[PDB]
């Protein structure tokens, strides 16, 4: 009735393989470790595609043609799967078989998704907004602001236009953080973490 933990015993045995779709097969299919890894893989899958459904138009409904090579490429470049997760999927897409089908309609969802993830999970008390820039988004940025009022009806992520031209980032993307909820300085773009 229970599923055998099979060649392992505890979660710590599986840590290294929780984000690796290629090594999942190495566990017996009827084993608990195979299931545990599968719940983890699906968390990554749904975090990517539930938030940015238009990416499935690129890959098809299974998402396999993005998800499998991107997860392999993420391990290769030792990506952190931090708030910039979605931005790094877009970077991968730019060198992928899908590179010709990227437009503003794919770009803005992944920028919103990363600004949203930053403002939901970052715990730096001293940073209240993230500002995201892109070479494919001239003169604007995507700003994610932590909640500072229980009674806001504005979305926590907005697109904001700058009156003074903004330098294009060196990479596809750049970011900076602000203390408090204004943009009263441009310190220059930082490159994506990791």
């Amino acid at each position: 009735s229970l599923l055998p933990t099979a060649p392992v015993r505890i979660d710590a045995d599986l840590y290294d393989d929780l984000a690796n779709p290629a090594r999942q097969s190495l566990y017996p299919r009827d084993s608990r470790g195979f299931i545990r890894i599968d719940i983890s893989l699906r968390a990554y899958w749904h975090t990517l595609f539930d938030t940015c459904p238009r990416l499935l138009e690129l890959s098809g409904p299974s998402g396999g043609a993005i998800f499998l090579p991107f997860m392999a490429w993420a391990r290769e470049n030792n990506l952190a799967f931090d708030w910039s997760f979605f931005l790094w999927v877009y970077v991968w897409l730019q060198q992928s078989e899908f590179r010709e089908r990227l437009d503003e309609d794919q770009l803005l969802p992944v920028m919103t998704a990363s600004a949203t993830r930053w403002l939901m999970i970052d715990r730096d008390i001293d940073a209240c907004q993230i500002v995201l820039g892109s070479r494919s988004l001239a003169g604007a940025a995507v700003v994610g602001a932590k909640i500072d009022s229980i009674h806001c009806r504005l979305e926590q992520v907005q697109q904001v236009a700058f009156a003074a031209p903004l330098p294009l980032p060196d990479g596809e993307f750049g970011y900076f953080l602000t203390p408090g909820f204004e943009i009263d300085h441009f310190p220059g773009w930082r490159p994506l973490p990791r």
Binding site: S1, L2, L3, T5, V8, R9, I10, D11, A12, D13, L14, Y15, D16, L18, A19, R32, G33, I35, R36, D38, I39, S40, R42, A43, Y44, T47, N78, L79, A80, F81, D82, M120, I121, R123, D124, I125, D126, C128, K146, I147, D148, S149, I150, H151, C152, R194
Partner: protein, 263 residues
């Protein structure tokens, strides 16, 4: 038994205030580190009842000390303004070799010395007694966990926030009976319960999703041992993080009141 509900999203404010008016819950449990940039008085004035604190992303087992201390200081101020009935956090594994897990890991309970020293540091920063929640185990750490939490509580003075449905997940997944937790259940005042789902590819493996009505074996658990759960000052937070639907929540809230009547 007081019955609580967890507040995580600001868009659920009007619903939670409705549950307070209709006397469906008696306190609100804040996922408080979601709100560390709000004015603390605005939260206190939003809920016409006591509150309690649940900390999700302190990551106190791994976070660097400077960022951890700043978060602690901010939370200490929230504790002064709102006087939460209790303050609680987790024993979770968030990051493997610099890579964030999106489905959080069960710590290895062999690592007691590491967890002990981190717990003491974080409890010290918060300035109050900390309660630590059990994990909805999938792998066989479920068998180690009760003895681990009792030792940890003895040596550091933390309390245990006992999540009944996480333990039922652990039992369904690993065989570890929920009776292993009897001593902790008769000790702590503070409890959690929620619905759980299943792994998409294996219905026998239970996932702690908080998106669903409480299962029958979770309800038998609470009912079978209602005198062990219920105490002076006992509280139980119902958790609903997804499909946050007013009417389904009210079914589960009423079923808890059926099990734990007011007098």
């Amino acid at each position: 038994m007081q019955i609580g509900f967890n507040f995580t999203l600001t868009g659920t404010l009007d619903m939670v205030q409705q549950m307070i008016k209709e006397r469906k819950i008696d306190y609100v449990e804040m996922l408080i580190d979601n709100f560390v940039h709000l004015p603390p008085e605005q939260i206190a004035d939003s809920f016409d009842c006591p509150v309690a604190f649940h900390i999700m992303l302190s990551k106190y087992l791994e976070r660097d000390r400077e960022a951890l201390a700043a978060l602690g200081k901010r939370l200490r101020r929230f504790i002064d303004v709102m006087r939460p009935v209790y303050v609680s956090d987790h024993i979770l594994y968030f990051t493997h070799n610099g890579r964030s897990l999106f489905h959080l890991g069960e710590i290895d309970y062999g690592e007691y010395d590491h967890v002990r020293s981190k717990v003491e540091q974080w409890q010290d920063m918060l300035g109050t007694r900390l309660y630590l929640e059990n994990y909805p185990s999938i792998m066989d750490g479920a068998w180690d966990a009760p003895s681990f939490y009792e030792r940890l509580s003895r040596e550091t003075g933390v309390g245990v926030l006992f999540d009944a449905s996480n333990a039922i997940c652990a039992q369904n997944n690993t065989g570890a009976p929920v009776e292993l937790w009897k001593k902790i259940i008769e000790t702590t005042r503070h409890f959690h319960v929620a619905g759980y789902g299943t792994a998409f590819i294996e219905p026998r493996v239970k996932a702690d999703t908080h998106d669903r009505e409480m299962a029958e074996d979770t309800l038998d658990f609470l009912s079978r041992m209602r005198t062990s759960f219920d105490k002076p000052g006992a509280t139980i937070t119902y958790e609903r993080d997804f499909d946050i639907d007013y009417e389904s929540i009210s079914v589960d809230l009423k079923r808890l009141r059926d099990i734990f009547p007011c007098v």
